[PDB]
Amino acid sequence: PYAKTMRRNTILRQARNHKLRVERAAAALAAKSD
Amino acid sequence: GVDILHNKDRKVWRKEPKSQDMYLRLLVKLYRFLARHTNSTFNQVVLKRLFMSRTKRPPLSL
């Protein structure tokens, strides 16, 4: 049963990490623009 | 390609009495029903023994 919980947690963590990676790319672009 | 010896696969017990006499065959039908539907092991032995040959069920004297 715990499989569903583990999967859901993994998909949420993956989404959060991807959003963070996009944010970091945006910050690096801003530093280069400065 | 499995290394199993099929020498000892077919078990040589009996599943029915070789006798075609009906009265003994009507008794088997009555103990086939009891050997499986009672928790008893008496009815397992009595069923197994009805299948056996004349030499395997000898005359128990008085």
Partner: protein
Amino acid sequence: NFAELKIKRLRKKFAQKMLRKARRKLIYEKAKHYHKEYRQMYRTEIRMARMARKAGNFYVPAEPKLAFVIRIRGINGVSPKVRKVLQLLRLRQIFNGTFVKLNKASINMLRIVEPYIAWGYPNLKSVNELIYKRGYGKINKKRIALTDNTLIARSLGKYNIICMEDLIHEIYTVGKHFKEANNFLWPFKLSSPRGGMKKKTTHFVEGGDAGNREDQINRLIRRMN
């Protein structure tokens, strides 16, 4: 009356539903407990190796408790002692697999069949795929597929292995009831390695596949599972 017997038959039907749901939450929380164990097992192995290298000393990790032994060579032209050891490991057919715990008594059995096996120390995910997909149970001397939790519980419940995750735990973490859990599993009917073997005849050290493959059995488990 039957006013009772309608209501009495419902209560017993209810009692067995809440008996399932109580067992069901246990199977979840036992599985969530294991997710903590495997995290704590995985991380302490890396942790010990860091406090070694910080000092400059060496952390030699524990010799593996558990192997996965795959038969690779055929049934024709096999020595009688080598026949006996393969069929004590339950490797009676080419590309059969079984879990073998390591000790002094079992490595000497795994060195005496080194041409005719491909063995090694399997991964946690390598144990997962083998027990879920290829996992079959020896229930009443019949290879019945592990499709429900009430097959392992039916057979291995007395050793408190009541679900698939308990069995995977018992295999990977070689517990006190590994024998009753490993012998419950039917020897895994693996397919031929998808991509090709290197060289069946020779040892893995001399560019072959025959014998020990320490972490490298996991590359071939997914090749075969």
